[PDB]
């Protein structure tokens, strides 16, 4: 009796930095996923545990829609079993992930001529993220024994790095918007369903 509000995730004016990735919960609604898997707008559309051409045949207890910006060369880390700067320190999918990863080039929206320094990723971290963990700390990173006391310096590094997206960069260094759909089929009743 409700349409799922997927547009406010996919079509939003601005996307989050991956270190601060957004999450919207989708529940008690219906969606025609045909508009999704019949779109040519997508450079990545990989599903795990479900077949993309079958999402209209399944119901789920809960759907989460996570979204962020990375560069093209990093979209391969948004998958189960992957390591790297994004999967280790920014956005991590579990090994038993059931859902879809959707990505598209956003150079025209997220690049700027002087460089867009508003999109950031975490470069320093003492340990890897657990699945679906979000780390928004901007504490100076202590890379030695001496504490940093909020001051950058030797062995004292700002932990985030700006992508500096520029429209003239190569494709793998251009911004890509990503939406991760997590389908949860638990013991609760079936709320998020598909239709024609």
């Amino acid at each position, epitope marked *: 009796t409700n349409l799922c509000p997927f547009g406010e995730v996919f079509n939003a004016t601005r996307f989050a930095s991956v270190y601060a990735w957004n999450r919207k919960r989708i529940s008690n609604c219906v969606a025609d996923y045909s508009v999704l898997y019949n779109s040519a707008s997508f450079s990545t559309f990989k599903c795990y545990g479900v077949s993309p051409t079958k999402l209209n045949d399944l119901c789920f207890t809960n759907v989460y829609a996570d979204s962020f910006v990375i560069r093209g060369d990093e979209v391969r880390q948004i998958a189960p079993g992957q390591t790297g700067n994004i999967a280790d320190y920014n956005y991590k999918l579990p090994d038993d992930f059931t859902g879809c990863v959707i990505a598209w080039n956003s150079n025209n929206l997220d690049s700027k001529v002087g460089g867009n320094y508003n999109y950031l990723y975490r470069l320093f971290r003492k340990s*890897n993220l657990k699945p679906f963990e979000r780390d928004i700390s901007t504490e100076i990173y202590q*890379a030695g024994s001496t504490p940093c006391n909020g001051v950058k310096g030797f*062995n004292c590094y700002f932990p985030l790095q700006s992508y500096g997206f520029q429209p003239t960069y190569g494709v793998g260094y251009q911004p890509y918007r990503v939406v991760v759909l997590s389908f949860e089929l638990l013991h609760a009743p079936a709320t998020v369903c598909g239709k024609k």
Partner: antibody, heavy 117, light 108 residues
Framework: EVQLLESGGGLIQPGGSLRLSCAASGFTVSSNYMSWVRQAPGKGLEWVSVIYSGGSTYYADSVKGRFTISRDNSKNTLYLQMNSLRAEDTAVYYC???????????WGQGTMVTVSS | AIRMTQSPSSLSASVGDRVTITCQASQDISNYLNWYQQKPGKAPKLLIYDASNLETGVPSRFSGSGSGTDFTFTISSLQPEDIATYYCQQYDNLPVTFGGGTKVDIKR
């Protein structure tokens, strides 16, 4: 003073094992990106392995499945376990604290590994 | 793996000469290219990071230029303490890969 002092290199029979050590002063090995690079005598540089600040490890295809990079915080020491060693693994092995931000890169002075019967 | 093609493989130049080394990458590496200096007997020492940035401490006669595939490394006035083998290195695509090196002979 920041220092990287390496040890463990020697002559080992082919197929045998060797562990290299890189004892660091001036920074915390377990908190930093660190790598091993090798140089056969008279030749160029070849990357071997990297460990990220948070522990993920990557390897050159010529050593995948045979080498393991690791570290010990209590000894502030980086290691390179080298198994199933080959003649072509003969080289000087350097450890390095990798460049990530300016002012960080530094290499040790190297340990010689010889694989021969 | 990304192939780094460095040229020349050797050069000979007088004290005070401008010396330029080139490096070409097999694919786009943005500016994630560093230049190392290796003097005889010693480990390599980083001189230039991210194509054009002078590493802390490094004299101003060393410089670098480039983005994408084509890069240069310049010594403004060669000095006899610049006797070394110079290597490029791309570091953002694993495996890390080095150029073949440029051996530098100083003239007298």
């Amino acid at each position: 003073e920041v220092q990287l002092l390496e040890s463990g290199g020697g002559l080992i029979q082919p197929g045998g094992s060797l562990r290299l050590s890189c004892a660091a002063s001036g920074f915390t090995v377990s908190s930093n990106y660190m790598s091993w690079v090798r140089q056969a005598p008279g030749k160029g540089l070849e990357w071997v392995s990297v460990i990220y600040s948070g522990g993920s490890t990557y390897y050159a295809d010529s050593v995948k499945g045979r080498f393991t990079i690791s570290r010990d915080n209590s000894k502030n020491t980086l290691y390179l376990q080298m198994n199933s060693l080959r003649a072509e693994d003969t080289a000087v092995y350097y450890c390095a604290r990798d460049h990530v931000r300016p002012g960080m890169n530094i290499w040790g002075q190297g340990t010689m590994v010889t694989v021969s019967s | 793996a990304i192939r780094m093609t460095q040229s020349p493989s050797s050069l000979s130049a007088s004290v005070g000469d401008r010396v330029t080394i080139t490096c070409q990458a097999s694919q786009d590496i943005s500016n994630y290219l560093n230049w190392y200096q290796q003097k005889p007997g010693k480990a390599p020492k980083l001189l230039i990071y991210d194509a054009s940035n002078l590493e802390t401490g490094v004299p101003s006669r060393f410089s670098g230029s480039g983005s994408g595939t084509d890069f240069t490394f310049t010594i403004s006035s060669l000095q006899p303490e610049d006797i070394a083998t110079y290597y490029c290195q791309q570091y953002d695509n694993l495996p890390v890969t080095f150029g073949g090196g440029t051996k530098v002979d100083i003239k007298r």
